[PDB]
């Protein structure tokens, strides 16, 4: 699976 939403969201909190 690739849940990009939960890569970038790390970064973004």
């Given at each position: 699976?690739?849940?990009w939403f939960?890569?970038?969201l790390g970064?973004?909190?």
């Open positions: 699976f690739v849940p939960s890569k970038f970064r973004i909190l």
